[PDB]
Amino acid sequence: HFADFVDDRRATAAGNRPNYIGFRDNFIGMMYYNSGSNTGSFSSQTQQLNIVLDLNDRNSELSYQYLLADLTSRWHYFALWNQAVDDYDHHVRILENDGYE
Amino acid sequence: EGPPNLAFPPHVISNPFAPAAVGTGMTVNEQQQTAAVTANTVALIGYGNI
Amino acid sequence: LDRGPSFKPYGGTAYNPLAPKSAPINSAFTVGNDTHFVAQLPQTYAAGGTGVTEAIQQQVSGVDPNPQVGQPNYAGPVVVNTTNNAGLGRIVSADSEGQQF
Amino acid sequence: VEELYVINPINQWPAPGSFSSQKPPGTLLPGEDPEAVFKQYHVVYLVPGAQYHWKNILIEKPVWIYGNGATVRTSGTGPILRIVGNRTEKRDVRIQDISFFGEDCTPNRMEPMSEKLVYQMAIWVTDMKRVTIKGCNFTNFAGAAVFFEETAYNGFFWSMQHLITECRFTGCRIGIANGGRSEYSTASFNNFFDCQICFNVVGGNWNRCGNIAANCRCVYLHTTNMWYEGAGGNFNAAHGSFTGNTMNHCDYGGNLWPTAFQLPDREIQLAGFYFDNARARCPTWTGNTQYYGDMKILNFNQANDAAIFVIDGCALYGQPGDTGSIETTAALTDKVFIQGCQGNKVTLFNIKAANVVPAIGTIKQKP
Amino acid sequence: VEELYVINPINQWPAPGSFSSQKPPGTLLPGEDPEAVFKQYHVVYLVPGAQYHWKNILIEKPVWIYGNGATVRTSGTGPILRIVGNRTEKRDVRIQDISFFGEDCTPNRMEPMSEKLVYQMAIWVTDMKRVTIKGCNFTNFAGAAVFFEETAYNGFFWSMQHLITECRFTGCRIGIANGGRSEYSTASFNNFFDCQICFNVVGGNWNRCGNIAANCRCVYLHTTNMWYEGAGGNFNAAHGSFTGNTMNHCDYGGNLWPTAFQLPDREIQLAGFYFDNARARCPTWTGNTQYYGDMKILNFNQANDAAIFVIDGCALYGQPGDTGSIETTAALTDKVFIQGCQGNKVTLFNIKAANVVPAIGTIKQKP
Amino acid sequence: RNAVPNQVTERKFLVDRYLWQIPFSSNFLNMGTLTDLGQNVMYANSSHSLNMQFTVDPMTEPTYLMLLFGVFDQVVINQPTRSGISVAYLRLPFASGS
Amino acid sequence: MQFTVDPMTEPTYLMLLFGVFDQVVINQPTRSGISVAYLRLPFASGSA
Amino acid sequence: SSTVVVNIPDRSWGAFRGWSFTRLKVSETPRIGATQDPNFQYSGSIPYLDGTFYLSHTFQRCSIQWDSSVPWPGNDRMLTPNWFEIKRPINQDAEGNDTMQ
Amino acid sequence: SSTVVVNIPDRSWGAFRGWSFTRLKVSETPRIGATQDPNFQYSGSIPYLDG
Amino acid sequence: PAVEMNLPANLKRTFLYSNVAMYLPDTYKFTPANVDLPENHLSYGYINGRL
């Protein structure tokens, strides 16, 4: 875009700030869990009684996150369920200033 | 009571005690103050308020 | 729903409703070879003999002069000395599209 | 951002006293009576870029009014902003950054001056000392713009040090007016335009050091029995300074006011410098520019060789006919001198050739 | 002081609309676009003692800018603060208490003037009337400091009453510049320092009543085809006043600018008072102090005895050699008069002995 | 004919003389003054607490909220002997006891 | 409960959560017949 | 303020009959429990005792919870099951959910 | 604000398991009970439901 | 010589003024020029005097 701009002759540039946009981990936020007006239904036919009785107190997301920490490890990326997990960098957050060997 | 319920003459432009005075438009010179009468114009001019 | 151009949900009109129906606005029109000027001049300014100097010094734009300010407030129907005063208002030119109304 | 604090119901009590006073710290809102605010505070701010409407605002204690670009309009026969003082006030008045308008628009310059129009001013100081009018805009006044009256004082207490600077006067019939005994104050760098009289001088010993008067009929008026004298009238008059001013286009060019003025006693023909008083002396006259500006030296105090009127370092420059001409009375030829001057070829009525250095202008006689 | 009010949990609702607008009442923060703020308000305050950065700020409606000690810097080829008006504006402009800086430091005074540097000004008023520049500090401008253009107007509407007072100009190549037809305004008590030209005068009928020009090469420039004329150029020019100013050390002492100037048509040798125009007359000249300041009277309108240049009540005082000397053309000896003056022993080029009273200075001839 | 395009509409309503009533019954209609849920809450003499979060339009003046719980209210008044009148007031959901 | 956190210049929440026992039983006794019963202690949902 | 939050500690809700609610202005409502209300400086129609209610049209929504867990009515009865919605503005609400136009 | 003070009214605490608590920014937390959250203008890692 | 007036528009304008315009909130009204209203904003003089 622009880093400095005073004239057509003289102006320095810098590339755009990077921005990766994809789906969430586990496709969290794809589907209406625990919504009010939007509870999905698993009912039988010949009846219409909804089995799924969601609650606003219940969190059906972040219960699949805690279960999957118990069930498997974490470092493995499983492309089917979009099982790729938000990490950070161990040296951007807490940074060790050892200063140029 | 409310706003004044005024009545108006239908030819709406007029002087208050005279008919609409006839006249002629004026072309004007700039850089010197001289106004000449224009060629093909007659003007019905009402002055003041209705 | 589109109701069409035939829809008019009231009686009368909304633009200058108090005017007499025979009244024209201050305009100019070119019936014949000449042009005409039907006009009411509510604002007045002082201009002596050959008041062409005071006629140039009047400043106009799309907002001044105002068509609805007129005379001062309680000054009655005094006849104006056209020898001593000039008059000041607005016309719409004949060089305009549409039907004059 | 949603305020989910819980609440208990009210217990049918008489509620305790809740008040919401002190909403202006020192300001003044539009549509609020200024007489109760000027009484309470010493410094009164105004709303920036507001639109006021004042009429006959009586001020007794000296306050300061920071206008902040306000606009004060009026309507009626009263003045705006009446300032009445006493002799015992240690504080001062500073009116600043306000655009005073009138009950006019493109004013009636053909209407003659009379008793009806004499109260159409915007600042009328009765006997308040040390006022200051700084950075204002006065438009469209049928009477004076300011008028500094002064009552009878004694004991050589000449103090009353007023300042009128950086103002813009358009369309006012009379600019800075001043009553008698309004002595020793300055009024400079006020840019006059389209005024009939810039200075209706009654009180003397003033100092005018930079004013510009373009397209104005008269600049310096001093007669006997003018308008705007007040209590303690025409006494010890016309002693001021008049240095480095500008009075171009007073007779020819872009002037619009008529020549007659209709004083309370008589009618007179205005000029760019009109002076007729047998008891008053003449002001100092240096560095002034005149393009097409008349001068009428009619009468001063030359009785026992007591005054000599000297034009020094000024421009005259009136070519066509008698425009910009200097007129003197034939009994005053020996006392009107012009030493140091530049001119085009200007008509000098009743001025001798030896009394003017250098030799400029056309010398004629007006019997 | 600890806020132990209880709270209930949020009920998974869509939250109602919370807004935090109106955070400036009328102010202008640093790092905020001024074009969207000048459009909305009439009076714009600035943060006291801030540090701004403006470039090509277009102003269309007349606003007031209270600077409160702000500092506006710039960088680029554009002017600061472009003021473009129309003919129909009842309000006025007041720029106040701002320290405008340039894209320089200890400016390049050896670089010649050209087309590249002509847009390096800080205030460029196109046709806005009644502007006011009060209490500012302009430093280090390669072009002009201000430039008051004016387009072609008619009907003797000379109004345009501008004020430029109490300013400090350091290092600017051209000080107060003005276009043609920018008539009847004042510019006084501006303390110039280290400038090449204090006044690039094109429009006439100005009034300069107290300016100090120390260590400046030129003070009054008027030629044919200068820089900074604008639309509606050199017409009805050089009619102003020039009273009580100070132009010490223009040729000898602490002057630093070169003598050549490089006009768009030619190059000329600057002086403390340079004047060459056959169609323009001369300003009034009273009370000015000159220490070591040159004067060059080359050509004015003396054609049918229409103008006489008179120096009145001024100091000359140039002893060493030809420093501070007054130069006139040999065809203009009969029209340059010096009546009332004090001098050390100053070189007068082509001025007769009878035309100067009192007898001061050395009279020489420059063929 | 000269109507402006892109016209946005908005709806609102105004009720007067009316309290928004919410009945405490299983279906939201009236099968009885003493409702059917008014008899199930006293199952094993249980006690329940109640909070109600509301949402009103933001109005520029302080306003109350006339909330009024539906209760019953009764008297007895008996007169067994002359100069012997007596009462027993009782309000069932919100008893003013002792 | 009553907490104390470091002051922050933007508003925050408090994701507090009470440990409960979310429980279902699913009974499927007959074809096209199915029945559940949700129950949690202590914050039971739905009773009178 | 948009949200007001009432709170009742637990008690016997036996033979409860229902709710009713409407806003009232503070300046238009006295407090009867004393012999005089000195802050009551109004003399118009008082809607607390006259029934002249006019601020019923100004509720968006309403929610009722029993002992911090149970939502009332619950049991996914109406189309917004977890709270009542008195009014929902159009230019929202892509769903129908709007009687009487 | 430094403190936040909560309440639970009088009820039965049988088979209670424990507490847990963190903090979440208001701009970074949506509301799921609605069909649409018009005041949610954030698209980073949501801590309320990603862990 | 007659004068013409829109009669049903003037009955309509009086109805809109005395019934709807006269009963505005205090923000939209204004006091007229050169009149002294009492400082009690709940008194009769302040409600009557504003237009």
Query: Got a strand count of chain A?
Result: 2
Task: Based on Cα principal axes, name the global outline of chain D.
Answer: elongated
How many E-type strands of chain D? 31
The strand order across the widest sheet of chain D is 3-5-7-10-13-16-19-21-23-26-29-31
Query: Helix count of chain A, per DSSP?
Result: 1
How much of the polypeptide of chain D forms β-strand, as a percent range?
25-35%
**Approximate helicity band of chain A:** under 10%
Largest sheet of chain D: 12 strands, parallel
- Derived from helix and strand composition plus strand pairing, the structural class of chain D reads mainly beta
Q: Spell out the helices and strands of chain A N to C.
A: EEH
State the secondary-structure class of chain A.
Answer: little secondary structure
Largest interface: D-E, 54 and 61 residues
Question: How would you portray this structure in words?
Answer:
Chain C: This is Hexon protein. Chain C: It comes from Lizard adenovirus 2. Chain C: It is found in: Virion; Host nucleus. This is part of a larger assembly, with 8 copies of chain A and 2 copies of chain D (367 residues). With 101 residues, chain A is largely without helices or strands. Chain A is 8% helix and 4% strand. Chain A has 1 helix and 2 strands. Chain A has one helix at 64-71; strands at 4-5, 11-12. Chain A has a two-stranded antiparallel ribbon. By secondary structure, chain D is mostly beta strands. Chain D is built from 1 helix and 31 strands. Chain D has one helix at residues 35-38; strands spanning 43-45, 52-53, 58-59, 64-73, 82-83, 93-100, 123-125, 131-134, 137-139, 146-148, 163-165, 168-170, 174-178, 186-188, 191-193, 197-200, 207-208, 212-214, 218-222, 241-243, 273-276, 284-286, 295-299, 309-311, 314-315, 326-328, 336-339, 341-342, 347-349, 356-357, 362-364. Chain D has a 12-stranded parallel β-sheet, with no helix packed on it. The longest helix of chain D is centred in the first third of the chain and has 4 residues, at 35-38. The radius of gyration of chain D is 25 Å and the shape is elongated. The interface between D and E is large, with 54 and 61 residues.
